[PDB]
């Protein structure tokens, strides 16, 4: 089951996550399939750079987001857009 999860790539103390679709049987910050977005919880707005052109594509192909993934993809779109059939 390919999942949409987060990869930590920042520095010690200040994290910085990549929203990426990868297989569940791979390490956290290792192999993946295609980088989708970017998450920075270092400012108050909690900046995101989601890509709705590929997020819904992976969701249709069979991706399965996690809690934080589906909470980032909530207030940035592509969920109220993936629901529309």
Could you say whether residue 5 binds RNA (CB under 7 A)? yes
Site for RNA in 20-79 (CB under 7 A): 23-31, 33, 38, 41-42, 46, 60-64, 66-69, 71-72, 74-75, 79
Task: State which residue, 13 or 53, has the beta carbon closest to RNA.
Answer: 13
Q: Which two tokens stand for residue 1?
A: 């089951």
Binding residues for RNA (CB under 7 A): 1-3, 5-18, 23-31, 33, 38, 41-42, 46, 60-64, 66-69, 71-72, 74-75, 79-80, 82-83
């Amino acid at each position: 089951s390919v999942k949409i999860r987060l990869q930590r790539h920042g520095k010690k103390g200040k994290p910085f996550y990549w929203v990426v679709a990868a297989d569940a049987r791979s390490k956290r910050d290792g192999k993946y399939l295609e980088k989708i977005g970017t998450y920075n919880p270092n400012t108050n707005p909690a900046t995101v750079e989601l890509n709705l052109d590929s997020i819904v594509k992976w969701l249709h192909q069979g991706a399965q987001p996690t809690d934080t993934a589906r909470a980032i993809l909530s207030y940035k779109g592509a969920l109220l857009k993936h629901h529309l059939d």
